[PDB]
Design a protein around this nucleic acid. Sequence first.
RNA 1: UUCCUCGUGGCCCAAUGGUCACGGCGUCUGGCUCGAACCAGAAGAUUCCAGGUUCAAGUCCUGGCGGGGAAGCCA
Length: 606
Amino acid sequence: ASTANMISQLKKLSIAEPAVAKDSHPDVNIVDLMRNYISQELSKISGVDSSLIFPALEWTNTMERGDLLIPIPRLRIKGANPKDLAVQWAEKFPCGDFLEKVEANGPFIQFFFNPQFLAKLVIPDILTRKEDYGSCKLVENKKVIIEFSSPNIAKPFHAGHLRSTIIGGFLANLYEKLGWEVIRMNYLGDWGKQFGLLAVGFERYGNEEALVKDPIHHLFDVYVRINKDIEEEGDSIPLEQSTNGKAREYFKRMEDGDEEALKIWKRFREFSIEKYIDTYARLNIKYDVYSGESQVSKESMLKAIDLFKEKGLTHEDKGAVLIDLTKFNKKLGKAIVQKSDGTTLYLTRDVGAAMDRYEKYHFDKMIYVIASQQDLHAAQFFEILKQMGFEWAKDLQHVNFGMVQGMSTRKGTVVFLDNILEETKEKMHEVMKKNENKYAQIEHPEEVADLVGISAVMIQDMQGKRINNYEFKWERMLSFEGDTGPYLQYAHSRLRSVERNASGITQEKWINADFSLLKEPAAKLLIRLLGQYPDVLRNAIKTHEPTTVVTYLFKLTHQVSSCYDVLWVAGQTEELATARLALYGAARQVLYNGMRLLGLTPVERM
RNA sequence: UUCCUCGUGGCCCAAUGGUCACGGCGUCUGGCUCGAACCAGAAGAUUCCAGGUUCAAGUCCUGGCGGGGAAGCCA
Ligand SMILES: NC(=[NH2+])NCCC[C@H](N)C(=O)O
């Protein structure tokens, strides 16, 4: 067809400058196909280079304004009224089978895609590629190391630890979906006096048979108990001659390689990782490596010392060595790299770890998912690596996030993650029981309840931008009405239920449905929404925000739910039921894809 | 005290610099004779304040105010 010929042409077209065109994939992103069509046709009309038009096309804030629009003033056409050009260019714009309409509105031109055209390409594509619908592959292998969660092995997970964990998990899924090779790394805080305190504390209150049940638990009590011994004694008996002192020594003792002090280390660490594996799996996360501050090689450490001098970065003061970053950035200030007693610090270890990682992986990019509470820390060791001469220093990125507020150890207002998950699970289980008929159709009610509960906990956290702080509130986790995780699960479940009720019409028939039977307003809106998923993923890797995907999932499910009320699959002609099944089936697949990307587990019944 | 960050409807929150702003909660009005954890409709706007940059500012700049965070031997 002429239309068939154009599609082939457009899918092979590269109009935007290589810089941006490199991200244009009309073959797997319908909106990029439309960007090509619109840029090409508007160029013929305006006389403006299509590569200048392409980046000026923006997605709209609301569907009432079209699918794409262009602000005329953005083309910088001197001596011309933007409003008039909009009217002139829109009036003669060829729609073909691509566009339903083109409209001038103030200094803008709105482009409305033809939904029937979209349905014919998008629906079969979603049903065929399924989980790969909005994905992409790279011409050349790119490897990224994403470090997330990274708790200190000495403490249980509280509401706060959830953040780095799911943000990193999301980013890992997103990068893999878009072609990258991803290394999921957990940088355990398993070194420093922090750990040297557990050593002595365990020798003091360590209970063999007790450490059997649960490591992190017993080890926590010991830490709590030992911290009081050095917090109650006060500044009375000399540090080392007391307790806290004979703890700093055990650390430097561990640095010397004291087989005994190290054997206990490898024990607490190994016991924590085994437990971690199950905890992270519950959140659909499997790390490739459980690294740690203890894993920094001596070579890198020594090399870092040499570079600090070779570059004249460090200078002695107060008996300790630090780096004055003020020369490079006023904000960075001064940072200590070696304590008076010659021991390494958190910052010193990060520099050496970055060096080991590059040597072992030769990454093209490395992302640290760390709280903004550590913005300065990250900004300092990033700069240091830069001034050290490393070319790859520029490939490091800090993805921060805000705090979960309402937590306090010295107040006991802290809420543990396991208790949150368990409580949310029980609440969702309760809601599940209210519908006797539906409940009786679930094989593992308890397990389904946990998946719904976790979706509630993750979504409440990912709804706003990462940078935002948010106070812990049980209602945030327990709510199920409105824009919540359970809302996404319910949408997925009833779409599955609709499919099952019409199991007489297999998915094979859907791809060959008569898509001209999806002309109702509600159907057209849903179709347009389906074609946006690829753009959303692309934008999500740019913002690194789960909310970018979450926001879309709610727009998607809101429309599906609106449609659910007026577009019935059952009790229709075979052809209309097949077409609507195809539309709902495609919507479910996209929801499934997005939910899985975020780290949730879509349920079939609830 | 210095620096960073956030401020959007009674509460939470979205936004490529691109048309006085997306949703949810609360509240009002309706709908259970393919899943009502839902839907249809209503209502609610000093995008914190004063200026600035720009053809165009919720978005960028300076300052103020309020919340939060950080700031030479913790992580
Ligand atoms: N490379 C890093 N510093 N990663 C983050 C470490 C976080 C540290 N373990 C703490 O609990 O705050």
